[PDB]
C-alpha cells in the first residue's frame, strides 16, 4: 500500500508555504510601521500554530518526528525567526 498526497498537499503543505511567504512579507513593510509588522508576524505565528494542529489527526501518538511534522516545524521556525528578526531590528534601530 502507498499513501496518496492530494489531501496533504492541498491542506497542509501549500498553506504552510503560503503562511511562510506572508511572514516574509513583513520584511518589505516599511520600518517604523511597528503595529503592522508586529501584528503580521505574531498573527502568522498564530496561523501556523492553528495549521500545525491538523498534522497529527490521521496518525497515532507516535513518539518520533515524521516528514510532515518536520515540514511544519521548519515552517514554524521560519515564521518565528522572521518575527524575532523584526524585533531585533526595531530594538537596534530605536537606540
Amino acid at each position: 500500500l502507498s499513501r496518496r498526497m492530494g489531501y496533504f498537499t492541498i491542506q497542509t503543505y501549500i498553506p504552510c508555504t503560503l503562511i511562510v511567504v506572508l511572514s516574509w512579507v513583513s520584511f518589505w513593510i516599511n520600518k517604523d510601521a511597528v503595529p503592522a509588522r508586529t501584528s503580521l508576524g505574531i498573527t502568522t505565528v498564530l496561523t501556523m500554530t492553528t495549521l500545525s494542529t491538523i498534522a497529527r489527526k490521521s496518525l497515532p501518538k507516535v513518539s518520533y518526528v515524521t516528514a510532515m511534522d518536520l515540514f511544519v516545524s521548519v515552517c514554524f521556525i521560519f515564521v518565528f525567526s522572521a518575527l524575532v528578526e523584526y524585533g531585533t531590528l526595531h530594538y537596534f534601530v530605536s537606540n
Binding site: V25, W28, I29, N30, D32
Partner: peptide, 25 residues
C-alpha cells in the same frame, strides 16, 4: 501580497487631511 506591493511604493506616511486641496497631476 497586493497590499504589500502597494505599500512598497507609498512615499508619504501621512494620509490626506481633507481640507487641503490635492493638485492633480
Amino acid at each position: 501580497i497586493e497590499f504589500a506591493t502597494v505599500n512598497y511604493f507609498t512615499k508619504r506616511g501621512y494620509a490626506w487631511d481633507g481640507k487641503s486641496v490635492v493638485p492633480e497631476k
